Design a protein around this nucleic acid. Structure first.
Lengths: 205, 293, 104, 159
RNA sequence: AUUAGAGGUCUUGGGGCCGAAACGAUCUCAACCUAUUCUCAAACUUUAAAUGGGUAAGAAGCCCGGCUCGCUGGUGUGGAGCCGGGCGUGGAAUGCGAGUGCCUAGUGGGCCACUUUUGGUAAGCAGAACUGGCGCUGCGGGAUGAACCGAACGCCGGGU
RNA sequence: GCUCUGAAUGUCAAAGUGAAGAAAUUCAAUGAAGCGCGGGUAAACGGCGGGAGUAACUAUGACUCUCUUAAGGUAGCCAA
RNA sequence: GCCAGGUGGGGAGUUUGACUGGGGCGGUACACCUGUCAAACGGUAACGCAGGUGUCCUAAGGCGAGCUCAGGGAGGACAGAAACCUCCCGUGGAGCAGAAGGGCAAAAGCUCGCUUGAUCUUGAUUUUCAGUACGAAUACAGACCGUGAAAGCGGGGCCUCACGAUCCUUCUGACCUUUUGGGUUUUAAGCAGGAGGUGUCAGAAAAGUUACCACAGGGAUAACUGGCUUGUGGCGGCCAAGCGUUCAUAGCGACGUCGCUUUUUGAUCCUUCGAUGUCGGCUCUUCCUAUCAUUGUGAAGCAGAAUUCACCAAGCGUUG
RNA sequence: GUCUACGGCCAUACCACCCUGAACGCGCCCGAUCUCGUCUGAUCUCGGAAGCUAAGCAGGGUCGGGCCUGGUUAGUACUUGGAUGGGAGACCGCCUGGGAAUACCGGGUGCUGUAGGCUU
RNA sequence: CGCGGGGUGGAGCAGCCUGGUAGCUCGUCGGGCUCAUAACCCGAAGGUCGUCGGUUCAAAUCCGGCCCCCGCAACCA
RNA sequence: CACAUGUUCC
RNA sequence: CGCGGGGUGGAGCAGCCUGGUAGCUCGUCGGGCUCAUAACCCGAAGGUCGUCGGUUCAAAUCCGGCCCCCGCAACCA
C-alpha cells in the first residue's frame, strides 16, 4: 500500500499545499474534525484536555484519523455518547510525494502526490477534548490511548482555559456576569467598550 | 440577503484619490503636462494663465508651480469691472474679454512693460500674436489652463484668452475655438467674433425680446433695466471700459479693517466632554429604565 | 496583417513628407552574369561534384514583408524599401474593419 | 538555468507600495537636479519609460547630464571582482535627492561658523567628530527607596 | 485553501404538515447573509526583522568678484564654462607606502565540512549559496585515517 | 518493380530556326529519350480485417447487421 | 569521334548532431520569456516546479475628446435565470491580442474624431556581457510630420519575449567612383540601406548496418562481487477496535505507529575496462540462528493421543 | 475667525448618519436668441438673477467603521558570531550581539503655500 | 523557381475560343406513369463563372497580380 | 424482371 | 507504469483535421398490402456528441482534469 511513516516524518520540504500547481491530490483520510456533542453550550463543558506535541514533525492524515477514532471510542464507553466534544486541531495540508518505480532511476525524479500530512510544531495542540470537570480522569485516559497512534512524543495537558474559549476558568463566570462575554453556541463572544453606545443598550436591557 | 460590499475589509484596502480630485477641481492628468518644467531649465518658471468661470464671476490668474504650491503673480476678477464701467453682466463673453485684458495690462504694469507691447488697442477679433521686440525685454509668455471646462468653439475661457493676447501676452493658440470659426466650412471671420467681444450677441437678444414679449424680457434682464443699459449703449460701454482698463490697470487692495474677533463656527468638543457624555447617556438610560420598573 | 495601398511618409528625394504608393516587393530574377554567379559556374564546371553548400535545414515558416514605396510626385519618381515584422498572411488595403456590428 | 529577461524577479521591487497606487505626486516632477548632485535610484513601476535596470534599484550615484525628462547618472556597479562606474539614463520618476551628503554639508556650516567664530575669541573649539566616548563617572542616588529584588519566576507549562 | 457551531430573513428551494389555496401560520431541511471560531500557503499578503547592499564623512571643499554663450528667457533670467581672490584645527576611529604598464605560464575533471538549501524513502546519492579547508601540507591530538580539533614548517639549544 | 502503347501530348538539354538590340545578350517557336498518362504481369518483391446480435435449459453461433480494404488467409497443418 | 539529356549502390568518396544519474528509446533542460527555487542588493544549479514563444495588429499604432468597468440590488408590456429601458451601490473584484508577474479609473480601459513618430539621419548609453556582437531597450540631437485651443505627446504595441554573421543573391539610392592607352555607350564591379537563413538559433551541405569486425583510449561510463542506502522483499515489536459460543491479549489481531535484517529486488557509481574467468549442478569444509527434529523446560480454548505458542540451545541430523 | 481661485503633502483628509451655518462667496436655480452639443438645453455650451440654503460645500456630533500614532503581545518568535554543549535522532539549551507581527487596550480625526474676499 | 492546365449552379462538366449567348448531368421540389423503390417524361428553384485591377459600346472570354491544385522540370545565402 | 413461409385437436 | 488512438440515438459508423448549423446504414414503433407473417409501401419517435471545467460572437470540433477501451514500445549485456 503506502510507505511506512518513517519515510515521511521530518519536516523536510517547504509546505506543498494542494493548489493550482499541485493538482491531482487524493483526499485526506480524515474528514470529520469535530465529534461528540458538538452542539453544546459553553457552560456545561468546563474542563478541556490537550494533547500537546513536543516534536517538530509531520503527522500523517491516517494517524490523525486513527487517533480520532480511538479517542472517540473510549469517550463513548466512558462519558456516554453526549458527555464530551472532541476537536482535532490539526488539518493535513502538506502534500507528500512518491517517486514510484514501475528502469529510469533518478532521471526526472519528481514524485507524484501520494498523501497528505500535517506539519506540527513544538508546543502545538494536536487534539482537544472538552467535557464536564467531573470526568477529568476520563479524558486523560482517552488522550493517553491516542498517543500510541502518533509518532514522536506528546504531552497531555489540562488547560486552564474554560472549554475551547481563550479565557481562563478562574475569570470566566464573572466576565459573563458583567456581560463581557455573551454565550454564542459552542463558543463565546467577547464584547469590548468600543462599539456604538446603542449596542450597549441592547445588552443591558 | 446579499453580501455587504462596504465592510471592514472594503475600507482597509480603500485608497482615496487626491484631495483636489475627490473634490473634483483638478485634472491631474492635464496638470502634469501643464505645470512641470523641463529638467534642463532649472527653476525657469513655467507661467500659465488660469481661467475659471463661475456662476457669478470670472477668475483669471497667472501662476507658476512651486514645490510648496502654485504662486499667483497677479489676478483679475470680474467683480472689479464695475469700477471700469461694466455695471451688469459680469459673466458673459464680453466680460471675459475685459477680465483677460485687465489681467494682461495689470501684469505688464508690474513688469515695467506696459509702454512696450501694447497689443490690439483697436479691437478687431482677428488672429493676432505679439512677437518680441529685439533690444527690448522679451514679451511675456504663458499657457492657458482651461481646467475642467469642455473647450468647444465659443467657450468663454477663450474670450479671456483673446483679451490677454490683445493685452500683450504671448499665449500660443489657434483661432479655431473662438466664436466665429465656421465648423462645416473651416474658416474664421473676425467680424462675428468682434460682435461677441463687444457684447452684441446679447444686445440683439434684448432687442429680440422687445417685440416678442416685454414681460419675459423684464424677467431675463432685470438689472439691465435697473442700470439703464439698453442695447444702444452696450457696444460703446465696453469700448469705454477697455480704454479705462488700459489707462489704469493697477490694483489697489481694499483697506483691511480690524474686526471684533468673534467665532461663528462651532469649536471641537474635547475628550473630557466626549467621555463624560457617555457616562450621562448610560446613567440616564438606567435611571429611565427603573422608572419603567 | 492589412496595410493601406497609400502612405503619406517622408520622401528622401523630395526631402519632406509626400504621398507614396505602397506595393509589395519581390525578388528579381538571378542574373546569369553576377560576379558570384560567374565564379560559381566556373567552380562547378568539370569534375568534383557540388562545390558550395546547399542549405537544407529550413526552419523559418515566414518572411519579413517588404513594401516598395514609390513617390507619386510627377517629377521625382523615386522608390525605396520599407520592412515590417514577420507575418503569415498579408494583404494590401482590404476590408478596412468596422468597430461594432453584427457578425455572421 | 534562469532567463535573462530585463524585469526578471522584480515582482516586488517595482511594485507600488500598499495603498499608494494611482497617479504620481507632482512634487517629484518639480524637483531640480544640478550636475554633480548625489542621487539615489529607486525604480517605480507606474512609469514604464526610462526605468533603470534592476541592478541599480537602491544604488546611489551622481548626476552628470540633464535632459528634458531624464538625467544621466554615474553609478558604481560591481562586476565579478571589479567595480565599473557606468552611465545610465533614468527618467525623473525613479529618482530622489540623496540625504546622505547633506548631513556633511550641514556639518560644514558649523565648522565654517565655529571657525570664524571663536577665532577672535581665541577659544579653540573642537571640530572633528569623535566616537561615543566611555561614559563618565557619576553618582546614582537611591534617595528613600532601596533597589527591589529580582528573582527568576518559576516555570509553568504554557500549552 | 479550510473546521465548527450560533443569530437572521423566505433572500430562494427541497418532502410536507391544517391549508382548494394564500411570504398566513406550521415544524422544518437546505443554501444565503451577519457576527464569531479551528487550521494553513515555494509560485499569497497588510505588517516585518537579524545578517546584508549602496553613498557620504572637504582643498577635486567651501566663500566672494568679474567675463563668455549661437543654449535658456517677463527680468545681466536660468544654467554651464571661464578667469581672479580669500579661506588649512587636513574636519570620524583603526591600520597601512601607493600608483601604473607591458609580456606571460599553468588551469578551465574537483572534493569535503559548519550553516542555509533543491530533487530523493534514503545514500560515503544528485544539485546549489556562504565561508573555511583538502587538492598544493608536513607537524601535535582523534589507536588507525586526504578533509575533524590544535597549529601551519629555514637548521638548532633552553623555556612555555 | 518489370514490361507494353504513343505525335492524341504536358514537361526537357545541347544544337539549329526566327525576331528585338550597336553588339554581348535577350525573347520566342520547335524540341529526343525519360518521367506523366493508359494496359499487362504475383512459380516478380510482397500482402491476405474489425465491432455487435442470433437456436427447444445453458453453452455455442449455421444465420443477420454494420464499418471497412488491392485481397481480407482458401486447401491444409499446429503450443511444430 | 566530340558535346547534350536521362538512367546508373555496378563502382567510388564521404557523412550519419549534442545534452543525458552508462548508452539507446523518450524528451529539449540546445535560442528566448513570466512566477518560484534564491537563503529581504545583484548573481546563483539539477532531465527542479507551474507555464509560454517562432505569432497577432491600418489599429490592437499616434494624438485629442468624452465616458467608466466586473458584479450586485430594486423596478419596468410581451420578457422567463437570462433580450431591452431606468435608478442605486460598486478601489477595479473588469478590460488592456497571448504565458505569467507588474502597472493603469476624468486612464494605459471603452466610444468617437483626425491621422501615419511603424517615416529620414548621426553618435551616446542600458540589458546579456569578455564588459564582444546580434536582439531588445533607454535618453538625447538634426530633419520632416501627426494631433490638440494649448502645454505637450508621438520616431510602433503599458512593461518584461516574439529572432539571425561572413560569402552569395536581390531591390532601392547619387547629374556618385572604377571598368584600366584615350573617348562615348551597354555591361560588370564598388559604396550605403532593406530583404532571400542558417530553430544544433555566435550560423557544416549529410542515412543505415556490423554477431565478420578493427584501432586509440575510458573504471570520467554500463553488465558481477564488495561499499553506503533500505523504498521494495523478509523478520519483529507497541496500542487494542475486534475474532476467539462466553472472554481484548490460549492463539490471533484491524485502523495506526516504532524498528531490525542485507539470503530479494532496486537506487547509487566509490574500486576494477595494459581483464578479478561472467548461470547452475557436482565435490568439500566451515560458520550463522530468525529452531524442522532431538535434550531440558514454561503456556494452552493441554483429559489421553496429536498439535499449537514461547524459553535455554546450533551439540547432532535434515534423505532417495 | 472663515471662504473663494490655484495648489503641496495625499484618509489625522475616507465612509455612514445627525445637527448648525452671520456676511461675502461657492452653489442650487431661471432661461435657449446667439455660440455650442445632445434621442432629450439632463449633461455640455451660452444668456441671466425671481427664489432657496433643501442639497452640495464648510463646521460640529457618534462609548461609530476605517485610518494615523502608541501601549501590550515581548526581550517572545526569529536571528549574527561561538563551543570536543545536550540529544539515537527530531531538535533544544547556553555564550556574544541584534530584535519583530496579530489579537487585546489607549490617544488622535487634516496640516499648509500663493492670491483675493467677508466678518467692513 | 520555370512551364503547362485547371478552379463555374449543392456536385462534375461545357461555354473561354474567332468577345454581346451562363447550358447539361446528378442531387433538391411538383405533376404524369407503374402493383411499387426504381425506371420513364416535363415543369419550378439552385453560378460574385477563384479573387482583384485595367482594357473593350460589350469579357465568365483579352491583359496583369494574388491564391489553390496537378504534372514535368530546376536548386551555391 | 422478383414473389419466401404456414398454425392443422376435430 | 510511461506513449499513442478511441468514446456520436437500440447496433455499427461519419462529421473533428480547419468553429458556427448532428448525419449514414440497420433496427424500433405506427398505418397499409396479405387469410396471416416476412419482404415491400407510407409515416413517426429516438442521441444531445464519455464526463468535469475552460477559450470563443458561437465548440461534437480548439484546451485541461477525470473514467473506460485498444494498439505499440519496454533493447546491449
Amino acid at each position: 500500500g503506502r510507505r511506512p511513516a518513517r519515510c515521511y516524518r521530518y519536516c523536510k520540504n517547504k509546505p506543498y499545499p494542494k493548489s493550482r500547481f499541485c493538482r491531482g491530490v487524493p483526499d485526506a483520510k480524515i474528514r470529520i474534525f469535530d465529534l461528540g456533542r458538538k452542539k453544546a453550550k459553553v457552560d456545561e463543558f468546563p474542563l478541556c484536555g490537550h494533547m500537546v506535541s513536543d516534536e517538530y514533525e509531520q503527522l500523517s492524515s491516517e494517524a490523525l484519523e486513527a487517533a480520532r477514532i480511538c479517542a472517540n471510542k473510549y469517550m463513548v464507553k466512558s462519558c456516554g455518547k453526549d458527555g464530551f466534544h472532541i476537536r482535532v486541531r490539526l488539518h493535513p495540508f502538506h502534500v507528500i510525494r512518491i517517486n514510484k518505480m514501475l528502469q529510469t532511476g533518478m532521471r526526472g525524479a519528481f514524485g507524484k502526490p501520494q498523501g497528505t500530512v500535517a506539519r506540527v510544531h513544538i508546543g502545538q495542540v494536536i487534539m482537544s477534548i472538552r467535557t464536564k470537570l467531573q470526568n477529568k480522569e476520563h479524558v486523560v485516559e482517552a488522550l493517553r490511548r491516542a498517543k500510541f497512534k502518533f509518532p514522536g512524543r506528546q504531552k497531555i495537558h489540562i488547560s486552564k482555559k474554560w472549554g475551547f474559549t481563550k479565557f481562563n476558568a478562574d475569570e470566566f463566570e464573572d466576565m459573563v456576569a458583567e456581560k463581557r462575554l455573551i454565550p454564542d453556541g459552542c463558543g463565546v463572544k467577547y464584547i469590548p467598550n468600543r462599539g456604538p453606545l446603542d449596542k450597549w443598550r441592547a445588552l443591558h436591557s | 440577503f446579499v453580501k455587504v460590499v462596504k465592510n471592514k475589509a472594503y475600507f482597509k484596502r480603500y485608497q482615496v484619490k487626491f484631495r483636489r480630485r475627490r473634490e473634483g477641481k483638478t485634472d491631474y492628468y492635464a496638470r502634469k503636462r501643464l505645470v512641470i518644467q523641463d529638467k534642463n531649465k532649472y527653476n525657469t518658471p513655467k507661467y500659465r494663465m488660469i481661467v475659471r468661470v463661475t456662476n457669478r464671476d470670472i477668475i483669471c490668474q497667472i501662476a507658476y508651480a512651486r514645490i510648496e504650491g502654485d504662486m499667483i503673480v497677479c489676478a483679475a476678477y470680474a467683480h472689479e469691472l464695475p469700477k471700469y464701467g461694466v455695471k451688469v453682466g459680469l459673466t458673459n463673453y464680453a466680460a471675459a474679454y475685459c477680465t483677460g485684458l485687465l489681467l494682461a495690462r495689470r501684469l505688464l504694469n508690474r513688469f515695467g512693460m506696459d509702454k512696450i507691447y501694447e497689443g490690439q488697442v483697436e479691437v478687431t477679433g482677428d488672429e493676432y500674436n505679439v512677437e518680441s521686440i529685439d533690444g527690448q525685454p522679451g514679451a511675456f509668455t504663458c499657457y492657458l489652463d482651461a481646467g475642467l471646462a469642455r473647450t468647444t468653439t465659443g467657450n468663454k475661457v477663450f474670450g479671456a484668452l483673446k483679451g490677454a493676447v490683445d493685452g500683450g501676452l504671448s499665449i500660443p493658440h489657434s483661432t479655431k475655438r473662438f466664436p466665429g470659426y465656421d465648423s462645416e466650412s473651416k474658416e474664421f471671420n473676425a467680424e462675428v467674433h468682434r460682435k461677441h467681444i463687444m457684447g452684441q450677441n446679447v444686445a440683439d437678444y434684448m432687442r429680440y425680446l422687445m417685440e416678442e414679449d416685454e414681460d419675459a424680457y423684464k424677467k431675463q434682464f432685470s438689472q439691465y433695466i435697473k442700470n439703464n443699459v439698453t442695447p444702444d449703449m452696450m457696444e460703446e460701454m465696453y469700448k469705454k471700459a477697455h480704454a479705462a482698463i488700459r489707462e489704469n490697470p493697477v490694483y489697489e487692495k481694499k483697506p483691511k479693517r480690524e474686526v471684533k474677533k468673534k467665532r461663528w463656527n462651532r469649536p471641537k468638543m474635547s475628550l473630557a466632554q466626549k467621555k463624560d457624555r457617555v457616562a450621562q447617556k448610560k446613567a440616564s438610560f438606567l435611571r429611565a429604565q427603573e422608572r419603567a420598573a | 496583417v492589412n496595410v493601406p495601398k497609400t502612405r503619406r511618409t517622408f520622401c528622401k528625394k523630395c526631402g519632406k513628407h509626400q504621398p507614396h504608393k505602397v506595393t509589395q516587393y519581390k525578388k528579381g530574377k538571378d542574373s546569369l552574369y553576377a560576379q558570384g554567379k560567374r565564379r560559381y559556374d566556373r567552380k562547378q564546371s568539370g569534375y568534383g561534384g557540388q562545390t558550395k553548400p546547399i542549405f537544407r535545414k529550413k526552419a523559418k515558416t515566414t518572411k519579413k514583408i517588404v513594401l516598395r514605396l514609390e513617390c507619386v510626385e510627377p517629377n521625382c519618381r523615386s522608390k525605396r524599401m520599407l520592412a515590417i515584422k514577420r507575418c503569415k498572411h498579408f494583404e494590401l488595403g482590404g476590408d478596412k474593419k468596422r468597430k461594432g456590428q453584427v457578425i455572421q | 538555468t534562469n532567463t535573462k529577461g530585463k524585469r526578471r524577479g522584480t515582482r516586488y521591487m517595482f511594485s507600488r507600495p500598499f495603498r499608494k497606487h494611482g497617479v504620481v505626486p507632482l512634487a517629484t516632477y518639480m524637483r531640480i537636479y544640478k550636475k554633480g548632485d548625489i542621487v539615489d535610484i529607486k525604480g517605480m513601476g507606474t512609469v514604464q519609460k526610462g526605468m533603470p535596470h534592476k541592478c541599480y534599484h537602491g544604488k546611489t550615484g551622481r548626476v552628470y547630464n540633464v535632459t528634458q525628462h531624464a538625467v544621466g547618472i554615474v553609478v558604481n556597479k560591481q562586476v565579478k571582482g571589479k567595480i565599473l562606474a557606468k552611465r545610465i539614463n533614468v527618467r525623473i520618476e525613479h529618482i530622489k535627492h540623496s540625504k546622505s551628503r547633506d548631513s556633511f554639508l550641514k556639518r560644514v556650516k558649523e565648522n565654517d561658523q565655529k571657525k570664524k567664530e571663536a577665532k577672535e575669541k581665541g577659544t579653540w573649539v573642537q571640530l572633528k567628530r569623535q566616537p561615543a566616548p566611555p561614559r563618565e563617572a557619576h553618582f546614582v542616588r537611591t534617595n528613600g527607596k532601596e533597589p527591589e529584588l529580582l528573582e527568576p519566576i518559576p516555570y509553568e507549562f504554557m500549552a
